[PDB]
Amino acid sequence: GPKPGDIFEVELAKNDNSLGICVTGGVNTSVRHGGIYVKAVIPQGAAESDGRIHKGDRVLAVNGVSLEGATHKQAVCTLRNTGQVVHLLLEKGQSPT
Ligand SMILES: *CC(=O)Nc1ccc(/N=N\c2ccc(NC(=O)C*)c(S(=O)(=O)O)c2)cc1S(=O)(=O)O
């Protein structure tokens, strides 16, 4: 598989179903690393259906936009405001599934 600490890109299509993602992190929200961790995933929502993204996975960028620094609300509203195919950048070292 990909190595731990591997930066990998996922293009998540919202083809199957609604996004059904939420995130946490930001300015030193609950999570210490402030990483934009996936907070919730709707069962068989786009992330879960795609199987690549799950809860606890950490996003850093969104279509080339460093989401780091931003608050958890922007992080959610960002996904919520993104389109069908979105380029998500994630780095390994995420929580278990
Ligand atoms: C998984 C999760 O946490 N989802 C969540 C959490 C809280 C709410 N309640 N109110 C709310 C609505 C909408 C927004 N932001 C945008 O619409 C861009 C916020 S936030 O900005 O404070 O996060 C809060 C809703 C939801 S939802 O089920 O994802 O709508």
| CATH code at position 56 | 2.30.42.10
The H-assigned helical ranges of the chain are 46-50, 72-81
Taking the CA of residue 80 as reference, the ligand 1 atom at the shortest distance is 18
Q: What is the domain extent for residue 76?
A: 1-97
Taking the CA of residue 74 as reference, the ligand 1 atom at the shortest distance is 21
DSSP calls for 19-37: --EEEE-SSS-SSTT--EE
CB atoms within 10 A of CB 18: 9
Whose CA is closest to atom 17 on ligand 1?
Answer: 77
Q: Kindly state the tokens that stand for 65.
A: 């936009």
Instruction: Name which of 46, 51, 56 is nearest 84 in CA terms.
Output: 46
For tokens 């995130």, what's the residue?
Answer: 23
Classified as helix, coil or strand, 62 is strand
Count the domains in the chain. Answer: 1
10 close to 52: Cβ distance less than 8 angstroms: yes
Whose CA is closest to atom 29 on ligand 1?
Answer: 22
PDB experimental method:
NMR
